[PDB]
Symmetry: D2
């Protein structure tokens, strides 16, 4: 199954480097990411992903199952 | 003078006590920040586009500080002062 | 009192729908941070809007978007102040 | 020359035919359009930042056409050719 997906999460940046590195390990899955600096400590990120829905879960696992990542949510949009 | 601005730049996410520093200064100045768009342009390089809002002088000074970090390339500020 | 992530899919060529979505968003521009738009296919757009403010106001605003005829896959993640 | 580019511009959202044309052109050139960030800067005006990818001739021709529409203001292009 192919399609798009939306992966949102909150984290304390002071981890930011690890998450970007994690996304690049799957960068042909990534379309773009929106980042909002919600307070001095916390970041809100929303990554839009495109491709195989199995690759998507692996991306989401690598990000969401990390310590420090909160409020994770994956929405899949299969074709 | 108030307004908006678009600050863009490219950096290497591995060479990244820099990555930590870029996000850290945005947070120190988060009153200026609206939102940032990040595109992974290849395995090594990140394009970031930071939309800023506030006093154009403060925006300029902030942007210069970001661009002056070793490893930030293609640093570019487009100012949109209020009409 | 918090943030939220509003995400939805719609057909951009639907003139009344598209006009209504952006019109509601501009009426509540004070509750809006920024929106990411990605083109899904020839017909369909994916938008992700980050919202900020009172959770009541933010939810009512999101409901006004999601209730529009033609908005698909509408989803709201509320992120109340911690 | 392949690469990326950052195209930014401002327009009034009440110009519905202009708005529809901007998005329809992005979908027409879907290969060129990566993603777009939109900020509702006030009740009337929109700021959009489109990230583009492709041949720099194609990207610049696309940007010209957007900027050439009456009602598009503050049109700006930053070209990032492949390094
Ligand atoms: Cu942040
Ligand atoms: Cu990156
Ligand atoms: Cu679209
Ligand atoms: Cu707008």
């Amino acid at each position: 199954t192919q399609g798009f997906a939306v992966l949102s999460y909150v984290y304390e940046h002071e981890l930011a480097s690890r998450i970007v590195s994690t996304q690049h390990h799957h960068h042909d899955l990534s379309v773009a990411t929106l980042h909002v600096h919600i307070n001095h400590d916390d970041c809100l990120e929303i990554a839009v992903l495109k491709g195989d829905m199995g690759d998507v879960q692996h991306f989401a696992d690598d990000v969401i199952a990390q310590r420090g990542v909160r409020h994770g949510h994956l929405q899949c949009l299969p074709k």
